Amino acid sequence: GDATATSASSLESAKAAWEARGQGKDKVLEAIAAWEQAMGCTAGDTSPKDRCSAPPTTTENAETLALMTRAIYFYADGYLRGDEKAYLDYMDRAVWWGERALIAASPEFGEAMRNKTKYHEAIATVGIAGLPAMYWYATALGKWARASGFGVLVGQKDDIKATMTRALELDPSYYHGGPHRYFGAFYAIAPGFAGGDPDKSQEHYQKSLDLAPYFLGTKVLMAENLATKLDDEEMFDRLLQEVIDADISAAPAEIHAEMAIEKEKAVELQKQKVAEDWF
Numbered sequence: 001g002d003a004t005a006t007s008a009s010s011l012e013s014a015k016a017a018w019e020a021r022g023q024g025k026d027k028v029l030e031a032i033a034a035w036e037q038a039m040g041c042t043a044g045d046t047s048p049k050d051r052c053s054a055p056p057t058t059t060e061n062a063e064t065l066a067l068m069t070r071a072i073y074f075y076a077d078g079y080l081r082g083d084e085k086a087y088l089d090y091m092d093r094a095v096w097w098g099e100r101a102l103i104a105a106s107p108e109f110g111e112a113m114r115n116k117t118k119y120h121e122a123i124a125t126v127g128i129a130g131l132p133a134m135y136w137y138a139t140a141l142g143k144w145a146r147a148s149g150f151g152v153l154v155g156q157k158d159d160i161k162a163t164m165t166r167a168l169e170l171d172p173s174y175y176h177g178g179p180h181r182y183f184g185a186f187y188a189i190a191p192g193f194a195g196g197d198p199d200k201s202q203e204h205y206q207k208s209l210d211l212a213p214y215f216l217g218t219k220v221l222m223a224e225n226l227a228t229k230l231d232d233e234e235m236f237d238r239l240l241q242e243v244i245d246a247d248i249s250a251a252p253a254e255i256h257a258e259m260a261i262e263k264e265k266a267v268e269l270q271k272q273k274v275a276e277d278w279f
């Protein structure tokens with residue numbers, strides 16, 4: 001019927017626009033709106049929870065929901081860094097859809113949370129089908145919490161760690177050495193008294209580069225939260241310049257848009273250092 005075929009076409013429209021995300025924020029926002037349409041949402045500019053009744057968290061939708069989580073994160077991380085309110089709004093949207101991506105991909109997880117099993121323990125049971133969900137949920141949750149402040153961040157630390165621990169168990173190479181890149185940031189951002197460890201950070205960051213030397217986002221995160229922490233101006237400067245100098249064809253085609261964002265982030269950090277007299 002009209003809506004089951006309008007959801008099949010909007011899924012097609014969503015995927016098409018997400019593949020064209022290198023064109024700019026518009027295509028990203030077009031992808032999100034089509035997915036949300038296919039997920040039964042009324043259209044609009046407010047939080048999903050105000051427009052999306054009973055999103056279908058079924059196995060056949062799990063891939064879509066984890067991709068929606070990544071895409072809303074991509075929008076905020078790429079385009080809202082200058083706008084704290086919007087950035088916080090949209091990272092929380094990605095968290096919201098990420099919770100539904102986890103439920104859809106993992107019946108055991110959905111069952112566990114209904115028997116009052118706490119996330120910390122439930123997340124450890126998610127199978128390979130849920131790795132995209134749990135990785136992009138943790139990415140959105142971490143960046144949302146970080147922007148909110150220390151109280152929110154430390155409140156989420158143990159659930160984040162359990163999530164990334166499970167992702168690393170399932171596949172340390174997922175999304176270009178993602179679980180290792182994530183832990184590099186985790187151990188650099190956390191203060192020592194909250195579990196921070198520069199040795200574990202560098203170890204994880206290096207393992208990520210060994211698995212995916214082309215992933216420029218690893219070096220951006222190193223410069224941003226480690227080189228600053230280590231008060232190593234030379235390394236901060238070097239990492240960012242290596243990012244900016246990297247050739248486009250060094251990374252796989254399917255993440256060219258992400259790498260372009262990371263080069264923009266490096267230029268932005270270069271100008272922040274000058275402006276705020278870092279180092």
Ligand SMILES: CCCCCCCCCCCCCCCC(=O)O
Pocket residue numbers: 139142143146153154157160175178181182185186189190191194217
């Ligand atoms: C002090 C409390 C603990 C601190 C918790 C730190 C969590 C930070 C989240 C890091 C986000 C990195 C996401 C990388 C995504 C990608 O692969 O592009």
